[PDB]
Amino acid sequence: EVKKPAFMDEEVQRILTKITGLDLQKTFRPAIQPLKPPTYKLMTQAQLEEATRLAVEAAKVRLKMPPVLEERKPINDVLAEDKILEGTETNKYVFTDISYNIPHRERFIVVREPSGTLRKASWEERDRVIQIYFPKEGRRVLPPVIFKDENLKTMYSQDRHADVLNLCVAQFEPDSAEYIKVHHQTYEDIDRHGKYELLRSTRHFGGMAWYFVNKKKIDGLLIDQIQRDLVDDATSLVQLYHMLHPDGQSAQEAKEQAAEGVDLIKVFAKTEAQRGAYIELALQTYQEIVTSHS
């Protein structure tokens, strides 16, 4: 079977990086944090261009996309059932192995319940206790209150989606249900309000386009990419959609006509586009502006 493309596939990372874009001014926007007096260097045009190159190298490492994973499966394993200890304790004991050189997902965290059952700690219990003994800067032991739907909607009204996602990465694990819930809610709000520009030149753009492709709702991103004159991006998105859905009518139509460039986007409109009429209109208007002006 032809393997389903992955998020980390070298081809997917190429396309997702391209559509995301780069902007040294947005990637290195000044942080509102304690400040220090700036330093100054006299540089030639050769040295200045070299410095810009290193800045673009850092912007690449800065824009590294966070993992997109499937929801973890509940841990429900009972190590022992010592019924002799039933009724001798009122509160659960949680035992955490805190050996330094063990990966956190390979640590043994067990719970001795009042009934006497010795079981493995659940996912929510595992993450809480690992914060208490291996604290991570940015993460809190108890789930914050900013992730509540009412609080999240407030952040969306202020157009603070990149923060909602940066907070979701410091707090929750990539495979946790809360992580997937918050990300899918942020991506969904961007679509309805056409706020795709907020996450451009950010590490969160790749996951957003991935989510739309898998959910077959790239229509809005194509319309918005075209209206911003980013039609190379729109074509690459249609390539990614024809890669993760090979047996789709749209992918089979592009093979029949050997479509390339702007042709690929036109094929998508007729075949699988939820709102094909608008993609053609925006694509047509773009062609008219380009042809008329140049």
Partner: protein, 108 residues
Amino acid sequence: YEDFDTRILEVRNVFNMTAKEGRKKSVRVLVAVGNGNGAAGFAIGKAADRGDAFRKAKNRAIHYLHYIERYEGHTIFHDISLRFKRTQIRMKKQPRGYGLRCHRAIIT
């Protein structure tokens, strides 16, 4: 010159011995002026009455207006160390939000 403000930096009661009056007193006032937008100056006014010394210094200082270069309008362009006679000054360029941390006269 409504956009300029005047500040007093010192008021002194100096004395000159005279045969007619013995000890005679004058008021020596040092003032500074500035528009808060890069232009400032100072002068000394002396008189027998304090009110007159204020007018003399205040209108004299408007004739000695330096223009001071501010980096982005909030700080000096670079560290400045100097000795004027026996007074030593060591200024340092600072980031936004640092505030003025200087001799009260320098703050003025």
